[PDB]
């Protein structure tokens, strides 16, 4: 199947949170390049084309790899509204 599908189920109380988590996470993960990635150089996803291993364009597949290391944190409340719509832009170039 998909990587550690069972383990990634356990991380959340409900099926759907992990879907909301993953997608939302991926959104940021492929908004700010892949500059936000709490996942090290050597543990990044890769392809095989042209005879050359190049990082996987599949945002959705990254966030899953990411959360699987527990490096993220999730909840119903963590930050305010447009008050996050500036923080991630400055720490990771929002251009």
């Amino acid at each position: 199947a998909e990587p550690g599908i069972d383990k990634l189920f356990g991380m959340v109380d409900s099926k759907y949170r992990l879907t909301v988590v993953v997608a939302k996470r991926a959104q940021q993960l492929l908004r700010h390049g892949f500059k936000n990635t709490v996942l090290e150089p050597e543990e990044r996803p890769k392809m095989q084309t042209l005879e050359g291993l190049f990082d996987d364009p599949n945002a959705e597949t990254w966030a899953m790899k990411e959360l699987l290391t527990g490096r993220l944190v999730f909840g119903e409340n963590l930050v305010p509204e447009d008050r996050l719509q500036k923080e991630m832009e400055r720490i990771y170039p929002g251009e």
Binding site: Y16, R17, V20, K24, V73, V79, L84, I91
Partner: peptide
Amino acid sequence: FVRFTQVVDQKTLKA
């Protein structure tokens, strides 16, 4: 129930 779930990273945890 779920929807409003937020995600952030260990470094932006410094926000």
